[PDB]
RNA sequence: AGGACCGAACCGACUAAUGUUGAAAAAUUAGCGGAUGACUUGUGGCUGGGGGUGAAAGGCCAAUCAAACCGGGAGAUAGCU
RNA sequence: ACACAGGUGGUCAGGUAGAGAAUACCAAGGCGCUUGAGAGAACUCGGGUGAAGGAACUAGGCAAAAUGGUGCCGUAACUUC
RNA sequence: AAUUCCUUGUCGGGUAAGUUCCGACCUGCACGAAUGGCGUAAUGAUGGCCAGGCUGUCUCCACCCGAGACUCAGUGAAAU
RNA sequence: CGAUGUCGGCUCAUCACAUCCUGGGGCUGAAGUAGGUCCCAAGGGUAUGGCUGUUCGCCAUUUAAAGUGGUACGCGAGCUGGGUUUAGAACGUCGUGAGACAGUUCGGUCCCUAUCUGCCGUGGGCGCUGGAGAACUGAGGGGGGCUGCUCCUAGUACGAGAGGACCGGAGUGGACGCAUCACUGGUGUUCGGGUUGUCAUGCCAAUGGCACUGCCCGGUAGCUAAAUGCGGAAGAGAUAAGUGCUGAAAGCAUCUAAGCACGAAACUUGCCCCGAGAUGAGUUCUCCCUGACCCUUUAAGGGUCCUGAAGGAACGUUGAAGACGACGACGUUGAUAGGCCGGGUGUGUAAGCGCAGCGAUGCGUUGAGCUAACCGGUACUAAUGAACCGUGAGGCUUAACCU
């Protein structure tokens, strides 16, 4: 009955939450500002920001365990070189959600979720 | 098949 | 939590191997049974020269339980196996004379105490 | 929080041993029998700790003659009058109920010297 | 499973009076363009509480 | 005499140094100030109503905040009455720490109790399920037969369905008091009292002596 | 060698569950039986209604079988509703 | 009757592990099954785990759980040998 | 007894306890010798019974994972 | 008969009392213990198994007890389908036969998405006579109500002896219920580790995907029981059966006609929960509104401009609150959620480098590295200034008072 239980199901099961919250983290990285969903873009709040602290110290098995969590090297390269030295100054909240309207399609409420550098 | 019958 | 069907080891050397609980006594709708508490019992396996025979239907008390009891401190003592000792269907007095392994200290009661004063672990 | 940490933290033990699991524990503990106080020794293998402050435990086992006993020791508690760590032993996982399904020369385990 | 016998236009109203959509109360007005929008969204134009966030 | 208002802090064991651990609910029960006192007079019952805590000034809505700053006291959370059973008389302001309780030896606790949600009736009433084998068809966790036939013709009121558990008032009633303190504002009770962690409780002395 | 054995394709249909205004007018899922033979399958023929065919259940003969369907006697007849 | 979880004969048949056309993961190649978005109640479906007990369930161990491979050792009554 | 009414025949075995099962006895209401009698190794998705193992069948349910049910937008039935 | 689905089992019950237990009494061929029998009493309770399709019954073993009936022999739009009672096949028997058998045997499709009443929950509207926010009284309604055993009195009263109390007082259990996770556990597909097969990241090393979470080993928080606290009461009133006191009718006698007292788990309270839609809509406290005009059917009238107050709702961040509504916290004059920091917990000594080894691997760095839902902090991110609804002192009559 969910008392005190974090994490949303987003009607997915393990393994298809996990491999869209990292195809939707390599995205962010990517691009810096992207339109998703809104439960969706609190849930990859709470799983893209740990990549971000996690570039703050830049080191092989920092660089690995990003790897391990992205798995595209581009990804982790971009991390490390530009969104380490870029966040260093910054304690959280690297991210920003801003909600857009509806979607024609499904009425989904949107919104764009993008780093606090732009 | 006699079961809900009157039989 | 020995309930009926629970096949218990035996603890002194009445003769029984495995007993068998076929009720567990007192109180009406009673389910398990602790150390304190006796049961009635039907005899599976006995020695070929023993005190009791196969199909006997008699009393026992728990002395050993895989759930365990519980201390006032806060511990718990779970043993390995399910054991008891065979009594007198009416005397309640036991049966055998040595007794085998450890038992609890929470068995100390008159017609246990005539029981515990023979284990050699208390 | 931080009161019921405090009520925990007087209500702790000052001195007590650090050991892991599979190190053979002798622990010393009090048993009353009416009128008369005694010290009762329980020797065994260390198969789980639960650290949780106040409320840690630890389950000793130990072979008695011919049945196997588990006793959960509250850590805090005032009935635990010694704890005393006669043999380390060099498992590697922290819960060791693996000696629960072994019995004999396959229950023995390696010494630390770390 | 089936009705006995079939409802009234008048149960059929008094059924559907809760089925009333809700309007929006007010768009609230931006402070550089003017632009009505939701309260905690972007404009069409993409602007929130007078900054430009979308290009 | 009158119960005091409290906040349920967690749950830990004391060890007594005789060797016995008893479980114990502690209540932190702040300063209570009496707003208001019914009498006789006015009300035809004669009453104490009590707040304690602190809430936010903006948070204080003008016939609150009127009230409260008619009779000498600040703004807590919430109200509360008490019914001065004979002989107790309150000036309002005035503040009711825990040495009542410190007196006392058995305790009242009555709070609302963890809302379990839309429960089932074997959650709720303890039912039994039926056969989850043998031929069984959909029918595992359903409450079987609610009635008899023609001859009732109706379901009877207080059939006991599913429906809404928890998140109702329940009072413990017997409690033992293990200690008190008074400079730390607690109160430690044997056992376990209705509410989540944070909950507002509040804390009579023991009526059913 | 074998109407041998274990076991896929292939053929079938023993149990359970689900479906029962179905995804399906006979299925699905998970186990199940035979699997070199009295096997299975394609293509083409032949047997026809008191007739066929049947390792036989009154089973099958175009979702129809103690006498198929179509059309005609025919607005059969109905002390019955 | 449907853009219907069914049915429908032949040909080709790669890699690693495997006895294998089983099975697991892949290649060439082809698809994500023409409503989505949330939430994470009862109940239903399909599964996973479970203290102590171990058929006490029930018409009935139904359903599950268990067992499972290769090589060697050993193997009873009975027998149509 | 796939046959037996009376009937849960009576005795024995198996069970703490056995209207079923197994062995007997014959009172065969109403077996019986190619509409075959009595055996019988092997076989059986065959009927009954007992045992070991195994377990959420159960004591007595608990929690978790997914698909519906619930809410939102789109389309939109049916029995009666 | 243009359909009212059977026996048994399961689940859930509900009532009667012709009471099985508990409780209260009378008589006894009632010494005690234990009974028998009758009267009062329906608050609560009232087995588990073997066999059988069975209800029943027999049996084994308990219990304080193992009530008896009604409710379509309660209950299939709640489940089952063993039995009887479809189509197959066989036995005995009957029949020349087709076939038949309250005779047996083996096998045999149990549909329904709930409109209305009902019931369990949870909301919207309007009312309660100015509006609002709170706290309550409580009419009334519901839940609950079981009981064993041990010890003391006391081995006393009683009895030859064997035996052995009433009354009263504690302790400790069983079943049941409510609550909560401190403990002991379960779960923990969101945490850590091992490992098999294969594919990929150029390769090594290190990881990732898939194989039921691939299979496993532990395990945080939550939830939860088998875990652990608590409960059933005491008392009060009025009584039933019963026992009385005084007392005539009826010089006596008499519990009764006048009058008075006792007397049960039943009744009313006491305990707990809901509850002013209790339209008979209650009480208490606090807060908020103090402007002009015209018209007409000069009415508890309409309209226009100016003001929108307390508060509410909407929105957003959310919650040990929740199907949705609702409920609660917060909205920068800020710890509501995420992040971050520190800790705690869990798992078990990361990777890389170096040494020993031919190697698998071991050792040092190192109780390392990683850590979900937890704890204490921190405005880093998101909770926008507003707009919207709600008004502008609130009718008549009578009484009592105040200027
Ligand atoms: C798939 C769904 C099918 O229904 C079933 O399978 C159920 C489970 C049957 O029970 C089956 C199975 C069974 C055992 O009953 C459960 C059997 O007894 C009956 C004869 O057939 C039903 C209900 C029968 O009714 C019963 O018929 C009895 C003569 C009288 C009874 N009444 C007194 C109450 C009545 O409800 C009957 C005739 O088939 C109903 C007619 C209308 C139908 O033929 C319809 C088209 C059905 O086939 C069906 C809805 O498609």
Redesign the pocket.
């Known amino acids: 009955?969910?008392?005190?239980?974090?994490?949303?199901?987003?009607?997915?099961?393990?393994?298809?939450?996990?491999?869209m919250f990292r195809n939707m983290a390599g995205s962010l990285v990517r691009h810096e500002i992207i339109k998703t969903?809104?439960?969706?873009a609190?849930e990859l709040?709470?799983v893209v920001?740990?990549l971000?602290?996690?570039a703050?110290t830049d080191?092989?098995?920092?660089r690995?365990?990003a790897?391990?969590?992205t798995?595209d090297?581009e990804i982790v390269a971009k991390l490390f070189n530009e969104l380490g030295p870029r966040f260093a100054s910054?304690?959280?909240?690297?991210?920003?959600?801003?909600?857009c309207g509806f979607?024609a399609?499904?009425?989904?409420?949107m919104a764009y979720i993008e780093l606090?550098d732009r | 098949?006699?079961?809900?019958?009157?039989? | 939590?020995?309930?009926?069907?629970?096949?218990?080891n035996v603890a002194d050397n009445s003769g029984a191997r495995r007993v068998?609980c076929?009720?567990?006594?007192?109180?009406?709708?009673?389910?398990?049974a602790?150390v304190g508490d006796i049961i009635?019992i039907?005899?599976?396996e006995a020695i070929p020269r023993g005190k009791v025979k196969?199909?006997?239907?008699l009393?026992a008390v728990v002395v050993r339980?895989?759930?365990?009891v519980?201390r006032?401190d806060?511990?718990?003592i779970?043993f390995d196996?399910?054991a008891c000792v065979l009594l007198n269907?009416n005397s309640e007095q036991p049966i055998g004379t040595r007794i085998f392994g450890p038992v609890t200290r929470e068995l100390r009661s008159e017609k246990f105490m005539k029981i515990i004063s023979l284990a050699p672990e208390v | 929080?931080?009161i019921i940490?405090q009520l925990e933290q007087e209500q702790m033990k000052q001195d007590v041993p650090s050991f892991?699991?599979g190190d053979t524990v002798e622990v010393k503990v009090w048993v009353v029998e009416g009128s008369k106080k005694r010290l009762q020794a329980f020797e065994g293998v260390v198969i789980?700790?639960?650290?949780?402050?106040?409320?840690?435990?630890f389950?000793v086992r130990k072979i008695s003659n011919g049945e196997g006993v588990?006793r959960?020791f509250?850590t805090h508690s005032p009935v635990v009058d010694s704890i005393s760590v006669k043999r380390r032993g060099?498992v590697?996982?922290?819960?060791l109920?693996?000696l629960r399904e072994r019995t004999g020369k396959a229950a023995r385990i390696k010494e630390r010297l770390? | 499973?089936?009705?006995?016998?079939?409802?009234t236009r008048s149960?059929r109203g008094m059924?559907r009076?809760?089925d009333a959509?809700?309007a929006?109360?007010?768009?609230?007005?931006?402070?550089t363009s003017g632009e009505k929008?939701?309260?905690?969204?972007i404009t069409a134009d993409g602007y929130?509480?007078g900054r430009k966030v979308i290009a | 005499m009158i119960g005091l208002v409290g906040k349920?802090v967690?749950?830990?064991?004391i060890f007594t140094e005789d060797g016995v651990?008893?479980?114990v609910?502690v209540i932190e029960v702040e300063a209570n100030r009496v707003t208001?006192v019914?009498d006789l007079a006015?009300?035809?019952?004669r009453?104490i109503?009590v707040t304690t805590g602190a809430?936010?000034?903006?948070?204080?809505?003008?016939?609150?905040?009127?009230?409260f700053?008619?009779a000498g006291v600040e703004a807590g959370?919430?109200?509360?009455?008490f019914?001065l059973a004979e002989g107790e008389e309150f000036t309002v302001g005035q503040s009711i720490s825990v040495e009542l309780f410190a007196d006392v030896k058995?305790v009242?606790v009555?709070?609302?109790?963890?809302?379990?949600?839309?429960?089932?009736?074997?959650?709720?009433?303890?039912?039994?399920?039926?056969?989850?084998?043998?031929?069984?068809?959909?029918?595992?966790?359903?409450?079987?037969?609610?009635?008899?036939?023609?001859?009732?013709?109706?379901?009877?009121?207080?059939?006991?369905?599913?429906?809404?558990?928890?998140?109702?008032?329940?009072?413990?009633?017997?409690?033992?008091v293990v200690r008190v303190d008074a400079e730390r504002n607690l109160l430690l009770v044997?056992?376990?009292?209705?509410?989540?962690?944070?909950?507002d409780l509040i804390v009579?002395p023991a009526?059913?002596?």
């Not at chain 1, 399609?105 to 409420?109: S, T």
């Not at chain 6, 959370?77 to 009455?81: A, C, F, K, S, T």
């Not at chain 6, 409450?143 to 809404?164: E, H, L, R, W, Y």
């Open positions: 009955m969910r008392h005190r239980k974090s994490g949303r199901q987003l009607n997915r099961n393990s393994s298809h939450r996990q491999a969903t809104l439960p969706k609190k709040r709470r920001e740990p971000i602290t996690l703050k080191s092989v098995a920092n690995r365990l790897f391990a969590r798995r090297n910054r304690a959280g909240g690297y991210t920003r959600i801003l909600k979607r399609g499904d009425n989904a409420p606090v | 098949m006699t079961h809900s019958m009157r039989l | 939590m020995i309930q009926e069907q629970t096949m218990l068998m076929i009720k567990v006594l007192g109180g009406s709708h009673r389910r398990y602790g009635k039907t005899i599976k196969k199909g006997d239907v009393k339980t895989k759930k365990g519980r006032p806060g511990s718990v779970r196996g399910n269907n | 929080s931080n940490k892991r699991p789980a700790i639960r650290n949780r402050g106040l409320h840690s435990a389950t588990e959960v509250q060099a590697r996982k922290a819960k109920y693996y770390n | 499973a089936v009705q006995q016998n079939k409802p149960k059924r009076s809760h959509l809700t929006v109360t007010s768009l609230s007005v931006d402070k929008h939701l309260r905690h969204h929130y509480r | 349920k967690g749950m830990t064991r651990s008893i479980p609910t208001q019914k006015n009300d035809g019952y009453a109503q809430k936010k000034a903006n948070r204080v809505t003008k016939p609150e905040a009127g009230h700053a008619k959370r919430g109200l509360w009455e019914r058995k009242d009555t709070g609302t109790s963890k809302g379990k949600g839309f429960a089932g009736t074997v959650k709720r009433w303890n039912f039994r399920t039926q056969d989850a084998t043998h031929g069984n068809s959909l029918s595992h966790r359903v409450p079987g037969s609610i009635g008899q036939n023609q001859t009732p013709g109706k379901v009877f009121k207080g059939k006991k369905m599913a429906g809404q558990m928890g998140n109702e008032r329940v009072t413990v009633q017997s409690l033992d044997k056992g376990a009292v209705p509410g989540a962690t944070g909950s009579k009526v059913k002596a």
